[PDB]
Each structure stands twice: as C-alpha cells, then as structure tokens.
Amino acid sequence: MKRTFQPSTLKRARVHGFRARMATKNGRQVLSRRRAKGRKRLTV
Amino acid sequence: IVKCKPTSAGRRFVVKVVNQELHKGAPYAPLLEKKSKSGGRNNNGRITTRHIGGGHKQHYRLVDFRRNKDGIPAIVERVEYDPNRTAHIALLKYADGERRYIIAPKGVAAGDQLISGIGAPIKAGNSMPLRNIPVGSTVHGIELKPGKGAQIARSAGASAQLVAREGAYVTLRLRSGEMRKVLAECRATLGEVSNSEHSLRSLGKAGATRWRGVRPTVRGVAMNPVDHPHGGGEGRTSAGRHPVSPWGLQTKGKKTRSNKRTDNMIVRRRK
RNA sequence: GAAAGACCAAGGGUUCCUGCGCAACGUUAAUCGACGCAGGGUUAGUCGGUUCCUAAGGCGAGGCUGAAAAGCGUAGUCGAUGGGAAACAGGUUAAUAUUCCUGUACUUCUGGUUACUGCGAUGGAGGGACGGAGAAGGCUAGGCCAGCUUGGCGUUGGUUGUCCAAGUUUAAGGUGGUAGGCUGAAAUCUUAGGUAAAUCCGGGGUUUCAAGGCCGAGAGCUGAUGACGAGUCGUAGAUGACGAAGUGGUUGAUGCCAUGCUUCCAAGAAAAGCUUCUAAGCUUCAGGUAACCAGGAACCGUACCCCAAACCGACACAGGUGGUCGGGUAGAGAAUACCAAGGCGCUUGAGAGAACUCGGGUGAAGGAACUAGGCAAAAUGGCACCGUAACUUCGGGAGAAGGUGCGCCGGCUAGUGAAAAGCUCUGGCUGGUCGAAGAUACCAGGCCGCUGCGACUGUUUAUUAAAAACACAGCACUCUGCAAACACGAAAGUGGACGUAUAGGGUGUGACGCCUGCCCGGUGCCGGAAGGUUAAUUGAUG
RNA sequence: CCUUGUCGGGUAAGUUCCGACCUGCACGAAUGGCGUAACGAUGGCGGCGCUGUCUCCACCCGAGACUCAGUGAAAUUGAA
RNA sequence: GGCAUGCUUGAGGUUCUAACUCUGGUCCGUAAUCCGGAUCGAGGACAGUGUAUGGUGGGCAGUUUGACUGGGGCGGUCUCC
C-alpha cells in the first residue's frame, strides 16, 4: 500500500534546498555546521 | 413560506421561505468583489474560533452605509438576494446614474425616497439626522460616531425605538432591551428591515447546516480529562464540576462586561 | 482484449540500438539478457517550458513592535493545478520525428517604401469572466449492410455460384455565415455621476424606423490533376518502376454546438493581452493609419520505462500510483461469455498417482438430530401481467407474500424520403414442432413472525473492538451594544466579521407525539448595603 | 442480590424468549420519563424452504507432501 | 460656644479645556490610507500604562501521601509500669 515517501523535485528544493536554508538564521547555522564537518553535499 | 412533503428522510421537516419579488439572476457588476474564506484562523495560522469551515463561493457586495448623497431623489430598481447577510438589499439609482446597494426597508420595487439633511420627511427609507424625528418612532441603521456608518439595528427584521430627547443626546431603546444615549448628529433611517420571515425556518437535515459554513460540535462530557474540564468518567457522568468553558470560564450566568469607558452612555442595563 | 493493448503527467537517469563476451548476477543451465567492455543514438516560429497576467500563500523597502535574536505589515515582486498568437497530411531508422523530407497552410515582429494624418498614462469605461441539476434537439467520429474492382473453384457429400476471400482511403486550412442563440435600432440636443479631464461610458429630452447587429457546430465546393493503394514487373531473398475499385443506405455516441437553454438555492475566481477615452507632454518630424516589397522568430526539454523487472515498498517483491483512447457478436449496460488490432506462456523441470493438508464436483434414506449459535455450504435470482396484510408521521410498508407466460418454424403480416421509392423498423394474436428440461450456459433477492437499543443518511480506535459509542436537525439556559463576549499572541496586531442581538460565543439534551413533580439547607452565580472584621500608605504617644 | 421468584403461552421436554403480578436489596422525569411508522453488515428468540452442518462418511478432479537431477536457508546448541 | 475670613488639607459633587485618547471624517507625503503630519468632531482629567499592595485563581507547575503484617488490602498496633 501507500508508503510514507512519495517523491517530487519541486517540494524537495523549496523545503530542503540551499536558498531555503540560507534564508533563515537557524538554517545558516545548519550550513556552517554541516560544512565544517566536511561533507561533500550540504544540500540534500 | 411553504412546508415540504415527506418524500425522503431529509425532506420531512424542511420549511422553506420562497419569495417571488426577488430579481432572478444577475448582480450589478461594479459593486461586487472578491471574498476569501478564513477557516477561523488568524495570522499565526491557528484556529481561534471553533466550528467554522467549508461552504460555498461568495462575492462580497459593497453595501452603502454612509448615505452621504444629499438632495438627490433616488429610485429603486429591484430587490436582490445577498448571501453574506440575513436581510435583502436594494439597488438604487439616483438622478444621474451612480447605482448603489443599500439595506432594503419594508418598501419594495420602485418607490422613490429622498436621502438628505432633512427632506420629504417621513417614509420607510428616508435617511435624516436623529434630532429631526418625532419621539416614539421606529428607526434602523443607526450611526454612533458621525460619518462612520450604520452599526446598530441592521440584521433581518430589526429596529429600535426613540424614547427621550434632551441636550446633545437622543436616548433610544434597543432591540435587546438596553437603553443607550446616542449623540444627536448621527444619522438614521425610518422604518424596519425587510426580511422578517426568517425566524420561521428549519433546515431539516444535518447536511443543510454544513453547506452554510458551520462544522459539527462535540459535547464536553464525551471527552477526556486532558481535553476539557468537564472531562472523562465512567458511563454517562453528570460532569461534577460547575459548568464551565473549555478554558475555565463560568458559563451559566456570570457577568463579563468590563469596558469601564462607555458606561456613562448606558442608562439601563438589559434585563 | 475497459487489459496482460496503445498514449500523456510525475518520477527515474542511458536501462534504448549494434559489435564483442558469460567469471560474478538471474532463486537451475545458458550460446540469452534490463549483466560486463567498445562504439552509436534525442534536430521545432506553431507540441510542452521560458517570456506576459494572476489565486491560495511567501518574502517585504520605508513603518510600527520587541532584552538581543526577531515578529507583523504598506508600496512593491514572486508564486499554476488556471487565464494570453499560430500545422496538419503522407514518406523515411538498425535506434528520432506534429521536430528531418516532399506537399499545401497559419500567426506575430522588425527594416525600408508609399499614401496620409492629432499622437499620448501604469489613469477612466467596455470586454475577458465562469454554479448544481435537467431536457428539447442539430451534427459528427465510428460500426454494419449493399454495390463495385483484384484473386479463387476446394472437406473427402455439395459448391461458375443468387458462391468465397480481401480491398473500397484522404487531413489542417480556404470559401461559406446554415441548425440555433442573444439583441430594439438610428438621429439630435443636454447633463449635481464615472476621485482631473473626456468627443468614451452613465442619466435625461425629442424624433424616425422595426431591426439592425453580434455569436455559431456542421453540410456542400475546394485542398487533391495529388498522395495512399491488393498487387505486378524489373541475386528480384533486399529493392527499382508500374498500380485497378476507390460508391450508395442505413445506425450512431459519455464526442462538438453549449462559456447555450430552462429551473432550483447553498447565489456561483482574479488579473492581464484585447477594444475605446482623455491628462501632462504635444513641437504636431516624432506618433498613428492602410498599402508594399525586404527579412527574422532567440534558449531549455525531446532517446527508453510509465497498473511497471527502469517509479514508491532492502529484492527481477500476488501490494500502491493522477489523466485520455477503447472495435465485433449477444446484452439496458464501460457488467458478463467468446474473439479482431496488439501482446504474452508469469526464469526450476521430469516422474509415480500413499496417508494427511488446501481449492473443488456428485450422493442412497433422513432433513438442524451438529453447535456457544443454521457459522459455513445449499437454495433464491430475468422480463411481462395478475395479485398483496397488520400498521402509519398518509409519503410509505412493498419488487410484501404468492402465481402464470417465455424455444425454433410458418398465417395473417413465409422513422428515414418530392414540399415518393429500401433499409433500421411503425404490432400483436394464430398454427405446426423438438426435447426430462426453452431467462437451457456465465450473469443474479432467501422469505416471514415477535421483541431490546439508537429517529434516520453519516463518522470512529492507519495494524485484534464498527457499536447501543461520537455526530445530527430540533429544544432550553446564559453571557455579548461594537474598539463586543471570546481566542491567539511578551507587545504591534490578526480571527470573530468587512458581520451588528431574527446576530455571535459557551454548556447540557438529542427527529416526532404526550409531558417534564416537590426541595434554596450545602456549594456556585446574581442582588444589596446598614453594621462588623480587613492591605500596603500615614506615624500621634510611650 | 436471594432466583431457574410466582402465573399463563410456545416444545415430547424451555436457567434464554413473549405476556402479566409487584413483595423497586439498588427505576423515575431535559446525566430527560414513557410511546413510536420507516430505517440498521445492531442484540435476543420462534417458523417455512433448504441443505454433507450431522447420524457416518464413500468416491472422483487439480495444486503440494513422496522419488530423481540442479541450486540450497532458518530459529536452536555445556558435552554425549 | 462659636462669629466671622484668611491661611493651608483631606473626602465628596458639578462644570471647563490644555494633557492624554479616537480600530471618526477630508487634505498632504503618495501612484499606498500601513504609518506619520496638518485641521476640524467626539470623549476628557476618566480611560489606559508603569511600580507597591489586597482578593480570586487545578487555568498551570514542582511535589508529598510511613511501617510491622504466618501474601497485602481492611482492621489492630507504634512510648512508659
């Protein structure tokens, strides 16, 4: 039956994208923390 | 006002109000605009007022309350239905076009009243200031601050009575029973509001309320103690607290006015 | 075969195609592969995007509010699942085509030219621009029949035939302005309105005339003398050339006219392009008006899967996934049975025919004796006519119960169109006849009598509880006079409500009918102040 | 509660059902009281038709179980 | 005693506008009516807001509610002669 994940690219970018994280103040701290660990991606 | 024949389980107790004076189909288009449905939700997004939702599309109609045109004879075209209101509204036409909606008085379908600092003075539908009218009359559409517009006695079949006059203040007795002193230069309108065939209606079925914009309510004794102070229990309990709001407010009689700024303008409290 | 077929949207990300391979994978073997290595392969003015305009909603200069972060919001500018110009037919490919190729089209823009000429806003008006249900119609796609061409002469018994098989195709756009719908028209003066102005719209006056005018499927003609065409002829396997018939009668939609029409209350999106008006500017060059040759239409996506082994479920997983197309014979029917186009044989096989387990078929004589309980199985089931109870809110109960008829072959009587001819079909009641059996198969009501509870349709514990629970229309009590009670918010403010006591919040009971008794001591709320006690604040006196 | 109270009906036989009595341990009037046509995938009884439910099982048809070739798990386990 | 009037002060009553208030009207910034500013209209020393203090306050929170016991719950018992 209906599993709990139905994919879409327009909903993914507006919630978890870069311009969404960079807009707020918590999200810019999510960027610096995830960058300074050294991850390859930063924008899932 | 007609009764319905029991053909189905919904049609057994429907009591309609039909009217053949109403203009069949069109609204006048420049006096019409967009209205959105709220859901009972403020700008935080949360529900403040409960039991609201759903319904039908409606256009807000710019009903004139000021009546600032003076010395112009106005002629009624027709009486229309208005969905965001319980009264009927009328379409006017002055001497030079400039059509306009107003709350319809008991007069209907091309009478020609006169809206002024005083003129033709007495009909149903003449607007004139509250000092130039006899005592004991019945008026509706009463301003309280001058220039602001009609606020009192405005719903279906409603009115107020003049009782006294002295000084700046012209006392009137409201429909509720409260007697206010009203400043004298606020305008008003002689007569009574049109549709009084409205307390004689019954919806009949559960889905008739639901397509008007009211959502089901649930009693407080059928909930848990975390949700409502009437709370849970075994079996049907008598809810052994004194009866109370879901926020802790005594509900079977507790005076709740605390304005303390307009108390001079009230003569007698509603009893 | 209303999918196990075709096609769009998501989503995926080279799985598509060809050479070379078979260690690993694939529930087995593999020469095979959606698997390895190497090449190849997506062509647009019109189809979708971007560009133009907006809905919910987001962000928000200045501005208010807040210990700080920050919150809310005006101008404004983002946001489609909606609104705004234009193209179809045939050929081609290992693999792409409404994109290339031939053929006929359509729309918009720029540069000159020519003939002229009041141009102008983001601002006014007009328009764009819309609900449910229902019924009249009018067409059309499609499907059959009948002709007509090319080929055939047999199943052994019959079959040159009144036989048999196949084929009988053709678009957008042009011209056309019909079925049908809406609509008074024209002149001429004038004007407390269209936040300025207006020669535009609105209102008023006179006069002349019957109405204009605006929408609109589709038929016919043309596109098309052309394409396509069974075939035939010239390793003729692949190709090159040629190519007959290409028509009439009926029956048609859930598809277009219809954004129409009538009716009913629950009273049914915005904004721009489009048409017109004028302000400032006007230099009336510029700008506009037609006419004309001349040229242009940028950039992204185009492969393959898409009720699936390529997407969501750890898998090549009986599950889940929005929208179009949808032929034939029976049938009311997109149900059901057999089939066309098209596609598949579900990636372990071979035996033998024990108990027992699962999914099924028939049964002597009984017919609930079984069991917590007729659970389960069996039975009933169609259409037409006859016939029908207590009870009732007078609708209903009710297709109550219960019963008869039905197949083939003959006698009668084997709408369409000249303001007239065949084919669908404009009847029903009479005979014969064959079977145990004529709704002959799949398809599809068990019925009745008493009683508890809840008036009903409805909703509820995703994954052991669908109820007598929750809802409900109806009833009563009480608070709320507008900067309202009330709620969310440190606050600004927003809901309530662009509503105004025939309204709005809260609490209980739950359609309808007959009714709702006594107790104000306890606790709560409301009313009253006379007197008692009673807070900081003052500070005499000792 | 005592309790399968007592009385009538239905069955050859009825701790349930229907109708009454009232001696209500412990009904009762908007935590509503008594009636009520039509509706329930609602609770309880009774009847006709019907039957492998059952006296009591007998036989037949498929897919597994069994044998042969290929691949090849799981929980469990101080040592036998 | 009081007489007068004063000087100051409390408590009450009425009235006035100039503080504050307006989720009133029309101008301006502005092409916006949010926010200001100008002017009239209403209320007016009230409302409202700081700070000190009374009352109400399961609306909300941190917590407490013993042992012996021929199972523990009920009951009985916890010290001295």
Q: Which nucleotide minimizes the distance between its C1' and the CA of B238?
A: D31
In whole angstroms, C19 C1' to B43 CA is: 67
What are the Cα distances from residue A25, in Å, to A20, A34, A40, B266?
Answer: 11, 14, 22, 53
Cβ atoms of residues B93 and B75 within 8 Å: yes
**Cβ neighbours for B79, distance < 8 A, ≥ 6 positions apart:** B21, B22, B23, B88, B89, B90, B91, B104, B108, B109, B194
Cβ atoms of residues B125 and B103 within 8 Å: no
At residue B50, the 3 state secondary structure works out as coil
**Cβ neighbours for A28, distance < 8 A, ≥ 6 positions apart:** A21, A22
B45: region left, alpha or beta (phi > 0 left; psi from -120 to 50 alpha)? left
Query: Which nucleotides of strand D lie within 7 A of protein CB?
Result: 31-32, 38
What approach was used to elucidate this structure? cryo-EM
Q: Which domains does chain A have, with CATH numbers?
A: 1-44 (1.10.287.3980)
> Does residue B8 reach within 7 angstroms of strand D, measured from its CB?
no
Q: Which nucleotide minimizes the distance between its C1' and the CA of A6?
A: C312
- Nearest-angstrom CA–CA distance, B199 and B203: 12
Q: Which nucleotide minimizes the distance between its C1' and the CA of B148?
A: E24
In whole angstroms, D53 C1' to A1 CA is: 39
What are the Cα distances from residue B205, in Å, to B11, B52, B62, B99, B147?
Answer: 8, 18, 32, 39, 44
Q: Residue holding tokens 């909903």?
A: A11
Q: Which of B142, B141, B131 is nearest to B170 (CA)?
A: B131
Residues B183/B186/B191/B193 CA torsion (nearest 10 deg): -100
> Does residue B227 reach within 7 angstroms of strand C, measured from its CB?
no
Q: Residue holding tokens 């639901």?
A: B210
B51 is in an annotated binding site: yes
- Nearest-angstrom CA–CA distance, A7 and B150: 55
Written as six digits, the tokens of B198 are 């409205």
The strands making up B187-190's β-sheet, listed across from edge to edge, are B127-129, B187-190, B138-140, B160-162, B169-173, B179-183, B266-268
Written as six digits, the tokens of B265 are 């303008």
DSSP track, B204-256: -SHHHHHTTT------STTS-TTT-TT---SSS----SPPB-TTS-B-SS---
In whole angstroms, C247 C1' to B81 CA is: 63
Element (H, E) at B72: strand B72-73
Written as six digits, the tokens of B149 are 């517009």
Q: Are strands B179-183 and B114-115 parallel, antiparallel or unpaired?
A: unpaired
Report the sign of the C-alpha dihedral through residues B72, B25, B154, B148, in that order. negative
Element (H, E) at B172: strand B169-173
Q: Which of B113, B71, B68 is nearest to B90 (CA)?
A: B113
At residue B150, the 3 state secondary structure works out as coil
- Nearest-angstrom CA–CA distance, B227 and B247: 10
Residue B100 forms beta bridges with which residues?
A: B92
> Does residue B271 reach within 7 angstroms of strand C, measured from its CB?
no
